[PDB]
Amino acid sequence: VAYWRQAGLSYIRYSQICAKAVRDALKAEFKANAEKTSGSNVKIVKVK
Amino acid sequence: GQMSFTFASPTQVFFNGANVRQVDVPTQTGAFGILASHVPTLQVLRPGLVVVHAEDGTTSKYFVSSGSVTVNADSSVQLLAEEAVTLDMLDPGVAKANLEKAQSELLGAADEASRAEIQIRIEANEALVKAL
Amino acid sequence: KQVAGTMKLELAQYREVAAFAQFGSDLDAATQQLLSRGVRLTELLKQGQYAPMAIEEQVAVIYAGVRGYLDKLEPSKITKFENAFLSHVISQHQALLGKIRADGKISEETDAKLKEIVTNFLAGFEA
Amino acid sequence: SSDTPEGVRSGAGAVRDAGGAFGKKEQADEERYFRARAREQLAALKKHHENEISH
Amino acid sequence: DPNIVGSEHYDVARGVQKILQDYKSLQDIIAILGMDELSEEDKLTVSRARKIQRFLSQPFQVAEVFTGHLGKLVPLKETIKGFQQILAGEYDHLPEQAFYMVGPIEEAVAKADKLAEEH
Amino acid sequence: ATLKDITRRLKSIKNIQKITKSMKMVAAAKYARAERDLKPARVYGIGSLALYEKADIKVPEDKKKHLIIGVSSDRGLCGAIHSSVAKQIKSEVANLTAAGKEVKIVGVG
């Protein structure tokens, strides 16, 4: 239990940020490998 | 002894299936050495380094974004990693200004969910600056 | 005869891969080359009505495309570059469009001089 | 019999020149796309027109 | 001829005919791959080409007993200007049913407002 | 079967012969990359299976709720990929909803 608990967040939310926080800290030579992940491909449409 | 050190990532497979001696695991509730009959524990990871110890002269250095251990009943630990990044491709100049940035935006959070999230962001950004 | 023997062959390799060009980016870098070079040479051969050309002037234009001095350009900028390359070489190089009209064959002493015209014009063009 | 000028060849856009069951499978497929973009675009018109006045 | 009709009339009517011959090479792909497989540049071609094809149609005055529409008579200076803009991209944000059976291009935006009010 | 009708039909299938022979050369490269990427991620799913060999866990008797997840693409023209998954899915919700558990499916793609 930590401060992200009792706040409304989870582990998958924790893993998306400290991936990007590492992946934005890279040099400007390996920027395309941060685009290799590119999680913004799947879309979401709801039934209602 | 008799320990298949598995370790990978979705992009490129790292040290895999090889008998390596000692592994460092960066974990909430601290770091703990894996010593050859280590007690099985399914704990997930925090940001930090893995300095893995083999008989090949000297140790290697890596960096796990958010990983998971599953050390099994026998002597077989499997480590995973979303971003098992190498350290040398990191730029210190833009990396420092992020740490003072988010602390400057702490009191602009009018809700209670994001106020933990900026506390997550400085902890991830404090994790690299001790490392580098 | 010297320049079209490299040109008729390379506009023939474009015809075999001419189907791939419609929906293609996931191909090999060699097949993506024949789609590149073959569409520059097609843009050279366009020509307006009632404008015949002298023979040694056509050996200037075709020497630019087939040798490699047009790959770094945009395909609507090919039919502009040819018209700007000709008016520079008629006026400021008229002494070298009579050294082909007399000798007939491109010697190496002219094959090394047109290299210093096209590359020294490809710099100061895109403006 | 295609590697000869005497042997006959085909044109571009001849599938819809026949009138078969691929020329119909394509004439209807285009209406099932460009009828539903016609009300993504239609809905946005009220806002776009207002926006022009704004700036 | 670029010496009788002018070099603006000529550059337009040799781009209308060039985008309509670009259409037919895509219609053989649509019959197999379907419409939602194409890339985002080739989708832009089919939409303008169907906008141009519908804009070439025009209600004659002698179709006032057949269709019930009203007749147009477009001057030449507006004909060149209207088609010049669909090729540019300045009407990429409209439905195709605006362009069917109008006169000048300013009547093809007075229909896309009536379709959005009666929605 | 006149001379015009035979020609226009024969001209059509000469088009369809080119398009499908190009479309094989496009999808021969996509498979050739998608053969390469899978063997790195083959060892990723080695680890999660190795969890269940040393610790043999099963669904013991009965649940109150349930999930069914089924993956696919959005693209057609692949033969028997999508109906080899939907007909598997209807072969289990008929097998379920008699032991009393509530099922709710999610389909990605």
* Three-state SS annotation for A5-26: CCCCCCHHHHHHHHHHHHHCCE
To probe the interface with F, which of D2, D9, D10 has the most F CB atoms within 10 Å? D10
The answer for residues whose C-beta is within 8 angstroms of residue E49's C-beta and 6 or more apart is E19, E20, E22, E23
Q: Catalogue the long-range contacts made by B54-59 (C-beta closer than 8 Å, 24 or more residues apart).
A: B54/B18, B54/B20, B54/B21, B55/B21
Closest CA to A23 of B44, B68, B124, B16: B124
Q: How far apart are CA B6 and CA B75, in angstroms?
A: 11
CATH number at residue E39: 1.10.1140.10
> Residue holding tokens 């399914």?
B42
**CB–CB of F71/F109 below 8 Å?**
yes
> Per the structure, how many domains does chain C have?
1
Nearest Cα residue to C119 out of C49, C70, C79? C70
Asked whether residue C58 is marked as a ligand-binding residue, the answer is no
8 A C-beta contact, residue A9 and residue B113: yes
Fold entry, domain A1-48: Atp Synthase Epsilon Chain; Chain: I; (1.10.1620)
Rounded to 5 degrees, φ, ψ at F108 are: -80, 125
In one-letter notation, the amino acid at residue B98 is: N
Hey, CA dihedral for B6, B7, B8, B12, is it positive or negative? negative
Q: Where are the alpha helices (DSSP H) in chain E?
A: 9-33, 42-55, 76-88, 114-117
CA torsion angle A10 A14 A16 A19 (round to 10): -160
Q: What single-letter amino acid sits at A47? A: V
* Residue of chain E whose alpha carbon sits nearest to that of D44: E116
For chain F, state the CA radius of gyration. 23
**Any idea where the domains of chain A sit in the sequence?**
1-48
The alpha carbons of chain D give a radius of gyration, in whole angstroms, of 21
Separation between Cα atoms, residue A42 and residue A39, nearest integer Å: 7
Tokens representing F54 are 């040393």
Check: CB of residue B19 under 8 Å from CB of residue B92: no
Residue F22 Cα, gap to closest chain C Cα (Å) = 6
Both structure tokens of D9: 């060849």
The CATH number corresponding to B1-90 among 2.40.30.10, 2.50.20.10, 3.30.9.10, 2.60.15.10 equals 2.60.15.10
For residues B43 and B29, the answer to whether their CB atoms sit within 8 Å is: yes
> How would you classify the pairing of strands B84-85 and B77-81?
unpaired
Q: Report d(CA B26, CA B46) in Å as an integer.
A: 6
Helix (H) / strand (E) element for B71: namely strand B67-71
Structure tokens belonging to residue D45: 């018109």
Q: How far is D23 from chain F (nearest CA, A)?
A: 10
Query: What b/e sequence results for D22-43 when a residue is b if at least 16 CB atoms lie within 10 Å of its CB, and e otherwise?
Result: bbeebeebbeebbeeebeebbe
Chain A stretch 9-48, residues whose beta carbon is closer than 8 A to a beta carbon of chain B? 9, 11, 13-15, 17-19, 21-30, 33, 36-37
Place of tokens 């477009």: E74
Question: Which chain E residues have a beta carbon less than 8 Å from that of C22?
Answer: 25-26, 29
Within 8 A by CB and 6+ apart from C94, the residues are: none
Q: What would the two tokens of residue E93 be?
A: 């944000």
Range of the domain at E78: 1-119
Q: Is F78 a known active-site residue?
A: yes
Contacts of C24 (CB under 8 A, 6+ apart): C31, C32, C35, F26
E72/E74 Cα distance (integer angstroms): 6
At the top level of CATH, which class does the domain B91-132 belong to?
A: mainly alpha
Radius of gyration of chain C (CA): 16
Residue that is written with structure tokens 């050190």 in the block: B5
Q: How far is CA C24 from CA E31, E35, E44, F26, in A?
A: 18, 16, 17, 7
Which residues on neighbouring strands pair with residue B44, listed in sequence order? B68
For the record, the structure tokens of E13 come out as 């009517």
Q: List, in order, residues 6 or more apart from B122 with CB less than 8 Å away.
A: B99, B102, B103
What the block records as the tokens of D38 is 């016609």
Cα gap A19→B47, rounded to integer Å: 9
Instruction: Determine phi and psi for C75, rounding to 5 degrees.
Output: -70, -15
Which one, of A4, A23, A22, lies nearest residue B117 by Cα? A4
DSSP conformational letter for E97: G
Residue F102's alpha-carbon distances to B50, B132, C31, F64, in angstroms, are 44, 52, 55, 6
- Tell me how crowded residue B45 is: count the other CB atoms within 10 A of its CB: 23
Q: Closest residue of D to E93, CA-based? A: D41
Which residue matches tokens 């190496």? C108
Nearest residue to E41 (alpha-carbon basis) of E28, E22, E24, E56: E22
The rounded distance, in Å, linking the Cα atoms of B127 and B83 is 14
What angle in degrees, to the nearest 10, is found between the helix axes of C78-91 and C31-44? 50
Domain ranges of chain B: 1-90, 91-132
- Residue pair C22/E22 in contact by the 8 Å Cβ criterion: no
| Separation between Cα atoms, residue B82 and residue C48, nearest integer Å | 60
- b/e per residue, F4-21, with b = 16+ CB within 10 A? eeeebeebbeebbeebee
Tally of residues, chain F:
109
Resolution to one decimal, Å: 3.3
Read off the tokens for A41: 């491909």
Say what angle helices B92-104 and B113-131 make with each other, to 10 degrees.
Answer: 150
Token reading at B116: 């933990």
Residue of A nearest to B123 (CA): A18
Reduced to 3 states, what is the DSSP secondary structure of residue B51?
strand
Residue B115's Cβ-count burial label (10 Å; 0-12, 13-18, 19+) is middle
* Touching partners of A (3+ C-beta pairs < 8 Å): B
Q: What is the total count of domains within chain D? A: 1
Parent domain of C84:
1-127
Give residue A40's Cα distance to chain centre.
Answer: 10
Q: Which residues contact F21 (CB under 8 A, 6 or more apart)?
A: C19
Method used to determine the 3D structure: cryo-EM
Tell me if residue F104 falls in helix, strand or coil: strand
SS3 call for C74:
coil
Angstrom distance (rounded) from CA E108 to CA B74: 76
CB contact, 8 Å: B95 with chain A? Answer: yes
Please check whether residue B86 is in contact with residue B62, taking contact to mean a CB–CB distance below 8 angstroms: yes
For tokens 């669904």, the residue is F59
By three-state DSSP, how is residue B4 classified? Answer: strand
- The CA distance from D18 to D11, in Å, is 12
Residue C41 · residue C13 · CB < 8 Å: no
